[PDB]
Ligand binder design. Sequence first.
Ligand code: HEM
Ligand code: HEM
Ligand code: DP1
Ligand code: DP1
Ligand code: H4B
Ligand code: H4B
Ligand code: ZN
Lengths: 405, 405
Amino acid sequence: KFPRVKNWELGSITYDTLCAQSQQDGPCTPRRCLGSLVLPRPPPAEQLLSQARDFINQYYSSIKRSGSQAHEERLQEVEAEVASTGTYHLRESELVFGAKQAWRNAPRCVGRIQWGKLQVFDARDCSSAQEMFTYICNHIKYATNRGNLRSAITVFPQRAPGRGDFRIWNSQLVRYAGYRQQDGSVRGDPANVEITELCIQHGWTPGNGRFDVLPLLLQAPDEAPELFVLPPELVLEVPLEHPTLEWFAALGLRWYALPAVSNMLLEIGGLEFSAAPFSGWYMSTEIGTRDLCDPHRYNILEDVAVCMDLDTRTTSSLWKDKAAVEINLAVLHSFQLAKVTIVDHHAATVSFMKHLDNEQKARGGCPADWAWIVPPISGSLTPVFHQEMVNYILSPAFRYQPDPW
Amino acid sequence: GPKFPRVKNWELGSITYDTLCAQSQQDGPCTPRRCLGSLVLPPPAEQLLSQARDFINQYYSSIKRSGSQAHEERLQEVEAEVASTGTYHLRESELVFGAKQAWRNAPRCVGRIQWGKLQVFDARDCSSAQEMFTYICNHIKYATNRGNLRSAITVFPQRAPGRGDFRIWNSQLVRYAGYRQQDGSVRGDPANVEITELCIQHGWTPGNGRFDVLPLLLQAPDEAPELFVLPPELVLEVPLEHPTLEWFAALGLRWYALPAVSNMLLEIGGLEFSAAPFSGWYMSTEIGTRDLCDPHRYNILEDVAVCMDLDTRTTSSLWKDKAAVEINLAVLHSFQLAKVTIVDHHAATVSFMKHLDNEQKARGGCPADWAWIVPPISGSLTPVFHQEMVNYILSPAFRYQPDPW
Ligand code: HEM
Ligand code: HEM
Ligand SMILES: N=C(NCCC[C@H](N)C(=O)N[C@@H](CCN)C(N)=O)N[N+](=O)[O-]
Ligand SMILES: N=C(NCCC[C@H](N)C(=O)N[C@@H](CCN)C(N)=O)N[N+](=O)[O-]
Ligand SMILES: C[C@H](O)[C@H](O)[C@H]1CNc2nc(N)[nH]c(=O)c2N1
Ligand SMILES: C[C@H](O)[C@H](O)[C@H]1CNc2nc(N)[nH]c(=O)c2N1
Ligand SMILES: [Zn+2]
């Protein structure tokens, strides 16, 4: 029934009872495990109503007023609206609780110890792409806070039956352009070649650098997306330098301060918010290891290794490993020097272990995706590597959705 | 699309579908409700017959005589033998095929590109613990081959109804003792404290070093295990030194050349070989990262970092990452200098990607455990991190079994 969960470094054991609350299926079956796969392969009134009731029940339990008079009336309100219109609307307080629970429930997030502190901006009164842009600029300004980053989420209008969705085409609010060139090489970020081309197609005059901030493509229901350029002063960037390798700064690398996912769907009580960008702060390995070292991304490993005069002739000199460590150290040093919030992978995983213990006491478990929680470098040097994890889907939740184009 | 799991490589953008998983006849630990992929450890003549028929079918398919008169005759011979004795026995060629397939099918082994090159030593005529020791010493001599390691497996008699099992109590043929200290600490390998104590309880006079090779505790059917000391000349070890850090040699670290798992059960056609030690050669991270750096093992990170004069007072200095890389480099360098076979994690993972492609063409897939295939350091710097994997159980197989005590 309840899975037994062991930590091999400490020998401690726990049982996950929270998974019993999962009402949505994952990709695995007794025949085969697909845990390492990245992506998965009006609604029934009864179904929506059951999801709504469960959520409202979650909400009243959180404010210690379960079964109260307020609880009963709210349940009747939801019942009334769904029966007459096929859908319903959340009160702002419920939306706030819901957004925090969705973060708390995200199996792939190692930063969940911060779940209770989230600034929620209600943007459900948005009726145009231009209004979306204003809300997004205010989100960025509040979240960045001159380097003292604050977690936030802005929630745009929910999906509605037979009507197009509000969407942000960009995968993050701040991303660097990727320009395809003659022989097929890429200047900038290869991961963003498609969005860059769409921006150009929608009238953007492209730059030609390696770190050009992309404009936003915002879309209101059933209308073509509109292009908006972020005011440079709102986008805080950090030039990268190394504490002892004087020549590193000359590589001309930099990264933006604010990580802000904008392509995920927020589901709360059966309602779906197709545009609900959220942001916290970076864990250093995201930039130092994946963005800068992935072979299909900036792929700077060899350049740095050569500068360090390492032997790139064979794998056994571990030049890739050495270069990677220095690049991650540069990221940490640079953000600290620029006074911009960032967390290293050791600190982040240590806090996640504390989060697991807190949740075991609070809810009897914590859904977690081991392959995503363990950092991309120095995996076993962190406590999470030695910790067995149980992965499952709880609601409220953040989920992937199809690209709008 | 195809009704089989779709598998993507995110570095290359390539896609394959796994059709081999359709051949699995044993369920794993996952369900649609929750994934337990990160967990380490999650006869009826009628049942035995089905497993035996499947295996014989696999064997005749491998030699391209499926459906032949010989295939049908062998199936009848197995049914007749099980009918009158309750079990059956494998032909020499069937055992060789079976042992190679068990390795080929092992989801947690990154060295499977070598699967077709396994020397299978038949020891099914073994009748005493003394003879088991002779077979084991012969395995070690052949496999070590003075540093030019050769993959091998020695198969002792299968389990038989009502009769005791043949068992090797040690987890590996070569392991270092772990001595619990007065203050509660451990001198040596913390992972081997239990087996060490059992050896002492069975008459072994312990040493007092950090790298004392343990004696073997061998068990013949229905007899107390017997103690055997391995002749030092047969156990090849490698003193550890670093290519540029001259003081590393002074730490007095060392490791053995031969990795030889001895506590796993080899299952072929329903038959169970409780004692079937196998050995290949080490991937450097096994020693440099797990054995030497795990907190619950030798735990030498701080010692090395202090010698490197790193800032061990803060996580952001990445002292653990820096020390781990140098320790792994020392292991590679030392084995190479000693002319002892070893493979670095970059070379091993590249060879495994080739294996995946070979198996896609040969069998339509390859069961693989992502959490185990991705190395413990520099995960995303290797190609396997970016490769989705499907995990499932195929037989013949190597399985864990309960400790004999
Ligand atoms: C406070 C600092 C935070 C830290 C350090 C943190 C860190 C991380 C990291 C390292 C990842 C993996 C990213 C990747 O590899 O692509 C991640 C994923 C995720 N985080 Fe957090 N996070 C933070 C705040 C937030 C906030 C504020 C939310 C939402 C309210 C959130 C929701 C998620 C979700 C949904 C994912 C999975 C996204 C995906 O599947 O691509 N995180 N986070
Ligand atoms: C030829 C060189 C080989 C290399 C480099 C290699 C490497 C590895 C590595 C790195 C692991 C993970 C070990 C751990 O983290 O505990 C592993 C696991 C495994 N290997 Fe291989 N292997 C080789 C040969 C073999 C042979 C000859 C067999 C059997 C005939 C084999 C059977 C397995 C099995 C069953 C596991 C899983 C063990 C467990 O679950 O604890 N390997 N191998
Ligand atoms: N630290 C965060 N990390 C998640 C966002 C950055 C991540 N490294 C990334 O590049 N995510 C892709 C994932 C696309 N599926 C994106 N949204 O563009 N988030 N945060 O709120 O603090
Ligand atoms: N490379 C191998 N690795 C597996 C053996 C060494 C591994 N690092 C290890 O310590 N395995 C534990 C497994 C504990 N479940 C043992 N048997 O003592 N095997 N080989 O045949 O080449
Ligand atoms: C194939 C594999 O699932 C994929 O490369 C995953 C592994 N772990 C990850 N972990 C994090 N945090 N982020 C990622 O993008 C990935 N990618
Ligand atoms: C809890 C987690 O499954 C555990 O620490 C695993 C992870 N991956 C591993 N991978 C390998 N090769 N060997 C191991 O012992 C482990 N341990
Ligand atoms: Zn699974």
